[PDB]
Amino acid sequence: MTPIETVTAFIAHWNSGDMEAMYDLCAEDVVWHNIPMEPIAGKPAMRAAVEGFMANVSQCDWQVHAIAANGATVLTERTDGFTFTNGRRATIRVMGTFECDAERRIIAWRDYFDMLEFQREFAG
């Protein structure tokens, strides 16, 4: 699987809610770093963080506007949409850098966005 195909599939798994397929595309030592926050180091810690972030989320609808790769690094421009438990929807504009390991799994995922845009929507 090429890096672009891997990241494309990763996003599709978020969108379908196939969380295990999502994790399976990641290295065991994946670092998930939402840039304004502390990095999350390793798949076990990623599972716990995802559980927290998804607690009040019923569905994801993440749209890739642009994607480009340079070797093992894949860059994205996205709008990440969510539907919350009560049916409210929100979107956050984000760019992400993904790095793939020697096994072509995601070993780093760094997302860049405005913390205020995030806090507005994930408050309450």
Ligand SMILES: CCCC(CCC)C(N)=O
């Ligand atoms: C980009 C800001 C929010 C993050 C974390 C999941 C809630 C995302 N990937 O959309």
